[PDB]
Design a protein around this ligand. Structure first.
Ligand SMILES: *[C@@H]1O[C@H](CO)[C@@H](O[C@@H]2O[C@H](CO)[C@@H](O)[C@H](O)[C@H]2NC(C)=O)[C@H](O)[C@H]1NC(C)=O
Ligand SMILES: *[C@@H]1O[C@H](CO)[C@@H](O)[C@H](O)[C@H]1NC(C)=O
Ligand SMILES: *[C@@H]1O[C@H](CO)[C@@H](O)[C@H](O)[C@H]1NC(C)=O
Lengths: 99, 50, 55
């Protein structure tokens, strides 16, 4: 698993948030991307940086990400620390996981 | 007249705080689909400030 | 009837831009916003009156 797509649509038309971990870093863009039906122009934001838990929230204005990496879905408890606050003013109704 | 600046006049709903909507999809005011075409009860959503 | 009123007000501001009277167009546009939130049809009469003053 490398990343996620978040937006109202995943077929251009409306801006989508693309978060991808590739080789050495994480690339985050909010372009009006044209996606494939099996993934694996107009941009307002761009940024470039085992059990892995993540929390994704979409508050007004920001898209919040929390995460935790622990050694090993086993029973147990831990809390996730905040990772990044992305100032992305978009509507998100659907998302896709990229493998 | 400087008609370069646009504002949205037609929208199906209100915005959330700090939401930025730049869609240019034709607004349907009536009961029938516009399919991207302006005309009776179909409008380009943005109006210029002259 | 409401649908036809909206179309008429829309056409009025469009014409006012074409005629080179942007202020009048801006005022009519405000009538559209209010109209789309109300059952008040007198906003058409105002759009037409403003056009007559311009023409
Ligand atoms: C995010 O976009 C969706 C559509 O992709 C919006 O849902 C629509 O809202 C309108 C206006 O109330 C309704 O008439 C449609 O029937 C809804 N469509 C669907 C599929 O539910 C949603 O409201 C938008 N979210 C925000 C915060 O604006
Ligand atoms: C990761 O993807 C970006 C494009 O988003 C590319 O420019 C970069 O070179 C890639 N990283 C590596 C190590 O290839
Ligand atoms: C970018 O969006 C604007 C509308 O805000 C549109 O006019 C323009 O053609 C788009 N550009 C591209 C390359 O899609």
């Amino acid at each position: 698993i490398r990343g996620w797509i978040f937006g109202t649509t995943l077929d251009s038309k409306t801006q989508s948030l693309l978060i991808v971990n590739n080789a050495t870093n994480v690339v985050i863009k909010v372009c009006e991307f044209q996606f494939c039906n099996d993934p694996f122009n107009n941009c307002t934001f761009e940024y470039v940086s085992n059990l892995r838990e993540f929390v994704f929230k979409n508050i007004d204005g920001y898209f919040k990400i929390y995460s935790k990496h622990t050694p090993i879905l086993p029973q147990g408890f831990s809390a996730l620390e905040p990772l990044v606050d992305l100032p992305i003013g978009i509507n998100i109704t659907r998302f896709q996981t990229l493998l | 007249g400087n008609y370069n600046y646009l504002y949205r006049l037609f929208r199906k709903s209100n915005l959330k705080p700090f939401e930025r909507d730049i869609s240019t999809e034709i607004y349907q005011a009536g009961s029938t689909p516009c399919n991207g075409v302006e005309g009776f009860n179909c409008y380009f959503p943005l109006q210029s400030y002259g | 009837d409401k649908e036809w009123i909206l179309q008429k007000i829309y056409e009025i501001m469009r014409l006012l831009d074409e005629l080179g009277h942007a202020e009048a167009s801006m005022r009519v546009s405000d009538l559209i916003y209010e109209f789309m939130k109300k059952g008040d049809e007198r906003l058409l009469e105002e759009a037409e009156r403003l056009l007559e003053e311009v023409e």
